[PDB]
Amino acid sequence: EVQLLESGGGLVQPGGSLRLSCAASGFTFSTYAMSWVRQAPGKGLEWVSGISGSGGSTYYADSVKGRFTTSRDNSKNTLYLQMNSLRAEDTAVYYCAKFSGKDCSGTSCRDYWGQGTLVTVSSASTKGPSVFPLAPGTAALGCLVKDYFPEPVTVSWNSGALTSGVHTFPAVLQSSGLYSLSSVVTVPSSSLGTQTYICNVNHKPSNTKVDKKVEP
Amino acid sequence: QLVLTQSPSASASLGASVRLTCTLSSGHSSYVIAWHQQQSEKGPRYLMKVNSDGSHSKGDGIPDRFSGSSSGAERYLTISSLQSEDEADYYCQTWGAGILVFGGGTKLTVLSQPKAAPSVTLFPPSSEELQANKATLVCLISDFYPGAVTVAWKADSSPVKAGVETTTPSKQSNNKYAASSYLSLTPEQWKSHRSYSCQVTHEGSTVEKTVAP
């Protein structure tokens, strides 16, 4: 059906600039107005901007007016949000969204959300994680993803071949300001000498990609 | 000014029904609103629209248990036969001239869910991290309900408070809670004591795991 996929989130210094994109598919892009909505950590949804189907008219919440700009490309089916003069309180997950209004009148009256992308405005700089293995009817083993900033970190096991028994825990925000998380997998105690276990840690903000082998 | 008023929280029992209320500010009593569901650590999911004649335009896969209704300036979302998965933040949303407007959202708690004892796994420092002249103890806590635990670390028997970082419990896909606690040590202290322990306490009962060099 409809799909909306954001990209471009990341870490920015105060006063800096960042452009978000939203790739849209499953509908004729230019017949619908497109919106941006954001959500600061632990707070409610806040409207940011809207843009007409033609791109001829743009609309902004007072909280971002004069600093954020929205545009669209109706051949690439992509919506944009250009941020300048960013402030710490602009830190939020930014959602792409499509609200239909009153027409429509059945399934065309549905609304759609994207998955969001995280924007961090901070004077703190990026740090990649250090990754350590966690050894050894079933056995438990994992990977320690220590001292990184900012979120997020993705962890897979055997490059996607191992998915059952995998639990990646939410990160702790240490008093140092850096995150740590752990990803654990439950495996039969027999394949310990047979099967090889590698966690694939990826931290895009620092271009860190680590593959760690976990052995007894 | 166009404003949507939602109470911050709501609660009802498992298997029962609950009504969430969104109220439009005076003068916008005929406006259409939309209900959006947002589970923890997820993006919003459109549910339906509600105008003055009630009506809908339910999103794909929205259960029949979900329904909407209207009365005057008030718009409702009713969820019958509540399940654990219905615990979420619910936002109403409307629009005016050149604006969208959101309610503050209502956090729905589904009461009477089964208590579940925590599962606890405790890892010692990795060899690699000890040659990095550091040492971390990792205590992983999962599959417990309700989502509240206290962790206690012990150098042998003497409890240790320094170097402890502990997450707030968050709800996992199994609809039970997870959390983790990290104890930082010098490699000296790890090797000095005969063992270290992680004590998790949940509804008056304590689960303890222990590790040693």
Partner: peptide
Amino acid sequence: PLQPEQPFP
């Protein structure tokens, strides 16, 4: 007032 058909025409 009356809400418009669409917020961003």
